[PDB]
Amino acid sequence: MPHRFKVYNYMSPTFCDHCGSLLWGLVKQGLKCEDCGMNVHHKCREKVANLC
Ligand SMILES: [Zn+2]
Ligand SMILES: [Zn+2]
C-alpha cells in the first residue's frame, strides 16, 4: 500500500529517511508520510519503494 507523502514544515533538524542527509531549508523541507512516519527530501520521494 502506498505512502501518502504530504509536504511538511520541520521545526527541528530532521533527516531524510532515504538518503540520511539533513532535510535542508527553512520551511517545506521535505515530505512526511501520514501513515508510517517516513520523511524524505523532494528529490528522494521517487527513489523510495512505494510500500507503506
Ligand atoms: Zn508510509
Ligand atoms: Zn534524501
Author numbering: 229 to 280
In the authors' words:
We crystallized apo C1Bδ under conditions similar to those used for the C1Bδ-DAG complex (but without detergent) for a direct comparison. We found the structure to be identical to the previously reported apo structure (1PTQ17) with a backbone r.m.s.d. of 0.4 Å. The apo structure superimposes well onto the structures of DAG-complexed C1Bδ, with the notable exception of the Trp252 sidechain. In the DAG complex, this sidechain is oriented towards the DAG tethered to the membrane-binding region, whereas in the apo C1Bδ it is oriented away from that region.
